[PDB]
Write a protein that binds this DNA or RNA. Structure first.
Ligand SMILES: O=c1ccn([C@H]2C[C@H](O)[C@@H](COP(=O)(O)NP(=O)(O)OP(=O)(O)O)O2)c(=O)[nH]1
Ligand SMILES: [Cl-]
Ligand SMILES: [Cl-]
Ligand SMILES: [Cl-]
Ligand SMILES: [Cl-]
Ligand SMILES: [Mg+2]
Ligand SMILES: [Mg+2]
Ligand code: NA
Length: 322
DNA sequence: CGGCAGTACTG
DNA sequence: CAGTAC
DNA sequence: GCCG
């Protein structure tokens, strides 16, 4: 009950504290872009706890009883109830909107955004004309609007099928699965996360590099962000009315398929919760394996096996959307 | 008092 | 390594 | 920010 990975994410669909969480999310984002990662994490978990709670919180004692809600978070909750506003919202640093603008460049995080801000930059025009940009950041800036748009899941299907058909031309036995938000059933997707493997345990070897050359040669790939080991990049379906879309690809041996599928399906906060739980049980969970701590690799032929070994009820991908 | 997921790319 | 991202 |  203290573990989100032990609960269905559909509990959030009936948020009875939206007036609270809408204001806390503003603070959470402010701490995040300013680099206060751990304070922001605490806010993120408190927001999920509030979103999934069964009733509107009405008392300081009720709030404190909720896991992920402590004294400080309770005090903020009582303020929004009594007064309808949260004073701290009127005292967020004026740098935050600009820091958010900059850190939405792919490849630029809090450290780069703060440095640019200290150098006097305030707009993407300033970044374009005056900032020093890595190769990655230049692609991010070129695709600034593209990378902030989410595509309809129907388009993600088309992208998945494009990768799959190019892969299976090399070996008809290859398996390709779109993971991430697509597999969790969301109506829109920030990118497409394609997992590739081969049931024979070995014929996945070598195809990653040939697959990319195939997709480049047919013009499907339009920019590469990372292209050693795994692929993070940019694609565009052919024809009119098409946008550049983010595409990630990972190729894994079949022996790791369940753990890779689990990792790549997420959500990110679901994974972090499941991994933290594994740690408390003397185990370690990664996209490669569930193992004992420093270790023995535990047998996980299917996703269900990972849940069972952690003592968790199985959750379909749609219920992992934390 | 100290962790807060685990891994992997770039330069 | 620090910074960034999945 | 929260929690053990
Ligand atoms: O910090 C992270 C980020 C992602 N992941 C895993 C889970 C996530 O679902 C998967 C793909 O990452 P994306 O950034 O593509 N996120 P997702 O597909 O969930 O949402 P969207 O792409 O629609 O924003 O990688 C993590 O484990 N930790
Ligand atoms: Cl939500
Ligand atoms: Cl499925
Ligand atoms: Cl290869
Ligand atoms: Cl043991
Ligand atoms: Mg995704
Ligand atoms: Mg992705
Ligand atoms: Na960024």
């Amino acid at each position: 009950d203290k573990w989100v990975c032990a609960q269905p994410s559909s509990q959030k669909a009936t948020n009875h504290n939206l007036h609270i969480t809408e204001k806390l999310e503003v603070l959470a984002k402010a701490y995040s872009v300013q680099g206060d990662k751990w304070r922001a994490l605490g806010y993120a978990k408190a927001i999920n706890a509030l979103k999934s709670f069964h009733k509107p919180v009405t008392s300081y004692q009720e709030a404190c009883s909720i896991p992920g809600i402590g004294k400080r978070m309770a005090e903020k909750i009582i303020e929004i109830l009594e007064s309808g506003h949260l004073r701290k919202l009127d005292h967020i640093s004026e740098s935050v909107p600009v820091l958010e603008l900059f850190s939405n460049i792919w490849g630029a995080g809090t450290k780069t955004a703060q440095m640019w801000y200290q150098q006097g930059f305030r707009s993407l025009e300033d970044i374009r004309s005056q900032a020093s940009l890595t190769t990655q950041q230049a692609i991010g800036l070129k695709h600034y609007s593209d990378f902030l748009e989410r595509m309809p899941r129907e388009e993600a299907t088309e992208i998945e099928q494009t990768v799959q058909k190019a892969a299976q031309a090399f070996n008809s036995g290859l398996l390709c699965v779109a993971c991430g938000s697509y597999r969790r059933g969301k109506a829109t997707c920030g990118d497409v996360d394609v997992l590739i493997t081969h049931p024979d345990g070995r014929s996945h070897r070598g195809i990653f590099s040939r697959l990319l050359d195939s997709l480049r040669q047919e013009g499907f790939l339009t920019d590469d962000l990372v292209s050693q080991g795994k692929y993070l990049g940019v694609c565009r379906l052919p024809g009119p009315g098409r946008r550049h879309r983010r595409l990630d690809i990972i190729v894994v041996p079949y022996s790791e398929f369940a753990c890779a599928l689990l990792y790549f399906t997420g959500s990110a906060h679901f994974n972090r919760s499941m991994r933290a739980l594994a740690k408390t049980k003397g185990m370690s969970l990664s996209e490669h394996a569930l193992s004992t701590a420093v270790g023995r690799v535990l047998p996980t032929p299917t996703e269900k096996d990972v849940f069972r070994l952690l003592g968790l009820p199985y959750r379909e991908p749609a219920e992992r959307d934390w």
